[PDB]
């Protein structure tokens, strides 16, 4: 019987847990032993007794990794955990070396095997394992809820004896997984929703949700005069918005600027911007990550760690992702890694201490 | 011949609404009235001084605001600096809440002021367009549901992805007045499974129409044994909820407790309570007004000045309420109060310093 260890997350403001009690039960039922650090689930509103009822050994941190073949985490494991990894153990979780370089060197110094959840490939067989996607959906939902929280206007159209109020104009810029959920959530709320993306397919997905595609003069590589035309057109469309939600990120780079000062300049007092790219510097020139700022009556919010806000469902989805990935790591309750499976091969950052990923090395 | 209306910057802590917004100022000036607006009055509601000037209002220093003004339109009651500058014969029109602002009421009677308390507009169909309590409740109820979504660790809507199915949040709105109905409508939009609790079958019918499920308790006053059976049943339903939004308030009196200690103890970690009755002590025993607290993993929020959060639209509907009311105060642009209109008689709190409202007379002695 294989044993899987789950730690309490320690990164500043992290509230998720890698496995929730309902997933623990299914693992235990299949044959695995599960060890869960005391209080691991408290950020996600899962008390120790729920893990205990599920069949987990709830244990002190320091006893967590004893006899563990698998360590499931959300963020990369801190040095204290790494130093307790038994040889041949596999660490599964987000690793993000760009934000976690010291921990990567430490892991490789200690010679583990690690599967980086952000490396799970985007093939149809791996959809159920896509943690990037499940946490994006969470972020996109919350971006819309925060936009409604921050706006001094109603999202929906409203008619009372006092008169008629128009719905809010919301533009989602960057229509990936998070952007699509932001569209759906704003649309639900009754906003007039507009979608900006350079990908025609992303715009198609947006139309199916009832968003209006923004169609710029150069139809979805631009010369530096075609950019003036594009930019002006986009500036004109953005000017009319009450809410902007921006989601465009590029892995290990500065987030692209989508909202320049000449665009912010034209926003009316009371307009809100929710910049989901705050972690890599933000899509808006005014964003201060972790903060709300207000300039000329435009409020610009740069959320960090949005999935921790939705700690119950962000954890459930992530747990389900790991549980589905676990089919390739566990057979009939036994440690049985499918080293030749394309999903495992793609997401494997190291095997017995040797790095296999290029950009990280 | 023409009347002047004064609009101050609000000064009460947390207050961001303004009594008139530029669109309404424009209609008044077009009607022949003059309007003066204190510098910065509109800034909380995102209306700069220039918008008021464009609408036809004079923008002026606070010390100058009330000069030659027969009408003063406010959100919260005027602070003493303003009361001191009122002309005699001038009418103050705003929320007053005397129990909370007794010293201001005292100063208004000493100045011999005439005041129409917006919270006293009668609940008649004729006054529906003037009902500030209703328009501000609609705002509060909307924001209750938004804040519930912001505070909850779970999704409101059902979600199916390749990672599985997530059930919709279970949301109970307790007290199905104007605010409650908008909380229902907004939680429903968001995809929650919404439940409604209210002792009024009519409230329950309105809720049902928005697609909420009426909570049906065993007893369709009531004995102590009956209230025990009703309570155990209510406690059972509540214990199953992810979100409780409470809205029950009684004019000039402590909020009824709808969530007792024994009920909150049955709530699962991660449940959220949004208590709209915080300003009068709260429907929930755990509520700390102006704060979010958490006990045993239950987060309890007691918002104060929710309408100030939605300052653009809270202000617009309020200004329109005042505009609609002004039909009974202004005629072809001139000061012409209809003293004998039932609406005016009902909402007049004092006239030339004479307090006309009974409960207020009691506090004053």
Of residues A161, A270, A316, nearest to B46 (C-beta)? A270
The phi and psi torsions of B122 (rounded to 5 degrees) equal -75, 145
All residues at 6 or more sequence positions from A254 whose CB lies less than 8 Å from its CB, including other chains: A280, A281
Looking at the fold, whether B203 and B215 belong to one and the same domain comes out as yes
Name the pairing type of β-strands B292-295 and B298-301. antiparallel
Q: B294: which 2 tokens?
A: 């958490």
Name the pairing type of β-strands B348-351 and B114-117. antiparallel
The Cα of A164 is separated from the nearest Cα of chain B by a number of Å equal to: 9
Q: Determine, yes or no, domain membership for A331.
A: yes
Whole-number Å distance between alpha carbons of A331 and A329:
7
- Residues of B with Cβ-Cβ distance to A320 under 8 angstroms: 163-164
Q: Are A160 and B135 within 8 A, CB to CB?
A: yes
Whole-number Å distance between alpha carbons of B199 and B176:
9
Q: Which segments of B76-235 are extended strands (E)?
A: 91-94, 114-117, 159-161, 164-166, 170-174, 193-197, 213-214
Task: Say if residues A22 and A56 touch (Cβ distance below 8 Å).
Answer: no
The Cα of B5 is separated from the nearest Cα of chain A by a number of Å equal to: 20
Q: Specify burial of residue A253 (Cβ count, 10 A radius: 0-12, 13-18, 19+).
A: exposed
CA distances in angstroms from B283 to A211, B117, B174, B305, B355, listed in the order given: 39, 25, 9, 16, 31
Name the pairing type of β-strands A292-295 and A212-213. unpaired
B316 at A interface, C-beta within 8 A: yes
All residues at 6 or more sequence positions from A177 whose CB lies less than 8 Å from its CB, including other chains: A132, A133, A136, A137, A140
Q: B19: which 2 tokens?
A: 């009594």
Q: Are A45 and B162 within 8 A, CB to CB?
A: no
B102 at A interface, C-beta within 8 A: no
- Residues of A with Cβ-Cβ distance to B324 under 8 angstroms: 162
Whole-number Å distance between alpha carbons of A306 and A243:
18
Task: Say if residues A92 and A117 touch (Cβ distance below 8 Å).
Answer: yes
Cα-Cα end-to-end distance for chain A: 34
Which residues in A62-85 are b (16+ Cβ under 10 Å) and which e? eebbeebbbbbbbbbbbeebbebb
- What radius of gyration, in Å, describes the C-alpha atoms of chain A? 23
CATH of the domain at B349: 3.40.50.720
CA dihedral A307, A309, A314, A315 (to 10 degrees): 110
- Residues of A with Cβ-Cβ distance to B269 under 8 angstroms: 45-47
Task: Give the residue numbers spanning the domain of B237.
Answer: 140-309
Q: Are B45 and A152 within 8 A, CB to CB?
A: yes
| Angle at CA of residue A28, ends A27 and A33, nearest 5° | 105
B135 at A interface, C-beta within 8 A: yes
Task: Say if residues B184 and B245 touch (Cβ distance below 8 Å).
Answer: no
Q: Determine, yes or no, domain membership for B360.
A: no
Which of A147, A162, A269, A299 is the best mutation test for B, with the most CBs of B within 10 A?
A162
Return the bridge partners of A70, or none: A4, A90
Q: Determine, yes or no, domain membership for B363.
A: no
In three-state secondary structure terms, B290 is coil
CA dihedral B225, B226, B231, B237 (to 10 degrees): 130
Looking at the fold, whether B93 and B211 belong to one and the same domain comes out as no
Looking at the fold, whether A29 and A131 belong to one and the same domain comes out as yes
Looking at the fold, whether A94 and A216 belong to one and the same domain comes out as no
Q: What resolution in Å is listed for this PDB structure? A: 1.8
Q: Determine, yes or no, domain membership for A344.
A: yes
B254 annotated to bind ligand: no
Taking Cα atoms as reference points, which of A154, A146, A360 lies closest to residue A247?
A: A146
Task: Say if residues A166 and B317 touch (Cβ distance below 8 Å).
Answer: no
Q: Determine, yes or no, domain membership for A359.
A: no
Of residues A127, A146, A268, nearest to B150 (C-beta)? A146
Looking at the fold, whether B301 and B331 belong to one and the same domain comes out as no
Taking Cα atoms as reference points, which of A280, B228, A157 lies closest to residue A258?
A: A280
Long-range own/partner contacts, residues A349-353 (CB < 8 A, 24 or more apart): A349/A95, A349/A114, A349/A115, A349/A116, A349/A119, A350/A107, A350/A108, A350/A112, A350/A113, A350/A114, A351/A113, A352/A87, A352/A88, A352/A111, A352/A112, A352/A113, A353/A108, A353/A110, A353/A111, A353/A112, A353/A113
Q: Determine, yes or no, domain membership for A361.
A: no
Q: A87: how many CB neighbours lie within 10 A of its CB?
A: 10
Whole-number Å distance between alpha carbons of A223 and A219:
14
Looking at the fold, whether A219 and A259 belong to one and the same domain comes out as yes
Sign of CA pseudo-dihedral B186, B189, B190, B195? positive
For chain A, the three-class secondary structure string (H helix, E strand, C coil) is CCEEEECCCCCCCCCCCCCCHHHHHHHHHHCCEEEEECCCCHHHCCCHHHHHHHCCEEECCCCCCCCCCEEECCCCCCHHHHCCCCCCCEEEECCCHHHHHHHHHHHHHHCCEEEEHHHCCCCHHHHHHCHHHHHHHHHHHHHHHHHHHHCCCCCCCEEECCEEECCCEEEEECCCHHHHHHHHHHHHCCCEEEEECCCHHHHHHHHHCCCEECCCCCCCCCCCCHHHHHHHHHHHHHHCCCEEEECCCCCCCCCCCCECHHHHCCCCCCCEEEECCHHHCCCECCCCECCEEEECCEEEEECCCHHHHCHHHHHHHHHHHHHHHHHHCEECCEECCCCCCHHHHHHEEEECCEECCCCCC
Q: B5: which 2 tokens?
A: 């209306």
The phi and psi torsions of A161 (rounded to 5 degrees) equal -60, -20
Kind and range of the H or E element at B244? strand B243-246
Task: Say if residues B280 and B249 touch (Cβ distance below 8 Å).
Answer: yes
All residues at 6 or more sequence positions from B65 whose CB lies less than 8 Å from its CB, including other chains: B6, B8, B36, B38, B82, B85
A199 annotated to bind ligand: yes
Kind and range of the H or E element at B38? strand B34-38
Q: Determine, yes or no, domain membership for A16.
A: yes
Specify the number of domains making up chain B.
2
Looking at the fold, whether A149 and A241 belong to one and the same domain comes out as yes
Q: Determine, yes or no, domain membership for B266.
A: yes
Name the pairing type of β-strands A243-246 and A272-275. parallel
Looking at the fold, whether A208 and A131 belong to one and the same domain comes out as no
All residues at 6 or more sequence positions from A211 whose CB lies less than 8 Å from its CB, including other chains: A172, A183, A187, A193, A194, A195
Q: Are B154 and A312 within 8 A, CB to CB?
A: yes
Of residues A45, A165, A311, nearest to B313 (C-beta)? A165
Task: Say if residues A88 and A354 touch (Cβ distance below 8 Å).
Answer: no
Looking at the fold, whether B79 and B37 belong to one and the same domain comes out as yes
HSE on the CB side for A197, CA within 13 Å? 27
Taking Cα atoms as reference points, which of A261, A260, A289, A296 lies closest to residue A275?
A: A289
Kind and range of the H or E element at B330? strand B330-331
Q: Specify burial of residue B341 (Cβ count, 10 A radius: 0-12, 13-18, 19+).
A: middle
In three-state secondary structure terms, B212 is coil
Taking Cα atoms as reference points, which of B145, B98, B74 lies closest to residue B309?
A: B145
Taking Cα atoms as reference points, which of A345, A310, A53, A330 lies closest to residue A178?
A: A310
Looking at the fold, whether A129 and A145 belong to one and the same domain comes out as no
Looking at the fold, whether A304 and A172 belong to one and the same domain comes out as yes
Whole-number Å distance between alpha carbons of A338 and A345:
9
Q: Are B155 and A270 within 8 A, CB to CB?
A: no
Looking at the fold, whether B133 and B158 belong to one and the same domain comes out as no
């Amino acid at each position: 019987m294989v044993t899987v260890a789950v730690p309490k997350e320690r990164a500043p403001g992290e509230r998720r847990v890698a496995l929730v009690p309902e997933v623990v039960a299914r693992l235990v039922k299949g044959g695995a032993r599960v060890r869960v650090e005391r209080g691991a689930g408290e950020g996600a509103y899962h008390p120790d007794e729920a893990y205990q009822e599920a069949g987990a050994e709830v244990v002190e941190r320091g006893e967590l990794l004893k006899g563990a073949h698998l360590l499931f985490t959300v963020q990369p494991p801190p040095e204290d955990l790494i130093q307790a990894l038994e040889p041949g153990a596999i660490v599964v979780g987000f690793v993000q070396p760009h934000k976690n370089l010291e921990l990567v060197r430490a892991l490789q110094a200690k010679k583990a095997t690690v599967i980086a959840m952000e490396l799970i490939p985007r093939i149809t067989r791996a959809q159920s394992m896509d943690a990037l996607s499940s946490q994006a959906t969470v972020a996109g939902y919350l971006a819309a809820i925060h936009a409604a929280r921050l706006s001094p206007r109603f999202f929906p159209m409203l008619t009372t004896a006092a008169g008629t109020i128009r719905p809010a104009k919301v533009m989602v810029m960057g229509v990936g997984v998070a952007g699509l959920m932001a569209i759906a959530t704003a649309k639900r709320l009754g906003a007039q929703v507009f979608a900006y993306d350079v990908r025609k397919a992303a715009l198609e997905q947006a139309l199916s949700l009832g968003a209006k595609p923004i169609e710029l003069p150069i139809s979805a590589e631009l010369t530096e005069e075609e950019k003036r035309i594009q930019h002006e057109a986009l500036r004109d469309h953005v000017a009319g918005m009450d809410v902007l939600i921006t989601t465009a990120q590029v892995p290990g780079r500065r987030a692209p600027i989508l909202l320049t000062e000449d665009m912010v300049e034209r926003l009316k007092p009371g307009t809100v911007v929710v910049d989901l790219a705050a972690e890599s510097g933000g899509n808006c020139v005014l964003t201060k990550p972790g903060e709300v700022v207000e300039v000329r009556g435009v409020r610009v919010y740069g959320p960090l760690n949005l999935p921790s806000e939705l700690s119950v469902h962000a954890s459930e989805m992530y747990a389900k992702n790991l549980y589905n990935l676990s089919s390739l790591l566990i057979e009939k309750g036994a440690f049985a890694p499918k080293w030749e499976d394309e999903i495992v091969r793609a997401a494997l950052l190291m095997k017995e201490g040797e790095v296999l990923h290029g950009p990280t090395k």
